[PDB]
């Protein structure tokens, strides 16, 4: 369960490819798919993003939310080396979800497996183990105290 030194490197790799710091579009597809399922397996959950054109994935308002998220996770996957810092960043990201009425721990489990479905369709030779081990490392700290 410990997101090892190798695991992070091995994850930062998987997430190096299937990624472009130059163009939003890719991030957007990767996100939407993460979301596509999330909902598909928890319709109810969908309601949490009413504050975003959820009912219209292909809409700006929404694609903007996808970017906002995909970016957050990139912002964290990168602190994966400098923990001290990461801690705050999650501690932060946390409060931002505590602020959102509803969204409880359980949800980061649906979101957990949501990503777990998408990646192999984006990153070449993906290490499910390292990803499920490090992805947790992050989601824990976000959904903690939530």
- What is the chain's alpha carbon radius of gyration, rounded to the nearest angstrom? 14
Q: Which is nearer to ligand HEM, 3 or 142 (CB)?
A: 142
Which residues in the 45-84 window bind another protein by CB under 8 A?
60-61, 63-64, 67-68, 71-72, 74-75, 78-84
What number of residues does the chain have? 146
CA atoms within 13 A on the CB side of 103: 22
Please enumerate in sequence order all residues whose Cβ is within 8 A of that of 30, keeping only pairs 6 or more positions apart, or say none. 18, 70, 118, 122
Q: Which does 100 bind (CB under 5 to 8 A by kind): ligand HEM, another protein, ligand MMC, none?
A: ligand HEM
Candidates 30, 138, 139, 142; binder of another protein (CB under 8 A) is: 30
Q: Which does 45 bind (CB under 5 to 8 A by kind): another protein, ligand MMC, ligand HEM, none?
A: ligand HEM
């Amino acid at each position: 369960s410990c997101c090892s030194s190798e695991d992070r490197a091995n994850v930062m790799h998987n997430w190096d490819a299937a990624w472009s710091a130059a163009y939003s579009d890719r991030r957007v597809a990767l996100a939407q798919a993460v979301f596509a399922s999330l909902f598909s397996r928890d319709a109810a959950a969908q309601g949490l993003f009413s504050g975003v054109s959820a009912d219209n994935p292909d809409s700006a308002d929404f694609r903007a939310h996808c970017v906002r998220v995909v970016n957050g996770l990139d912002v964290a996957i990168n602190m994966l080396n400098d923990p001290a810092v990461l801690n705050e960043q999650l501690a932060h990201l946390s409060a931002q979800h505590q602020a959102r009425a509803g969204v409880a721990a359980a949800h980061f489990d649906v979101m957990a497996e949501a990503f777990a479905e998408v990646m192999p369709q984006v990153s070449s030779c993906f290490s499910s183990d390292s990803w499920n081990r490090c992805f947790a490392r992050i989601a824990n700290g976000i959904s903690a105290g939530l």
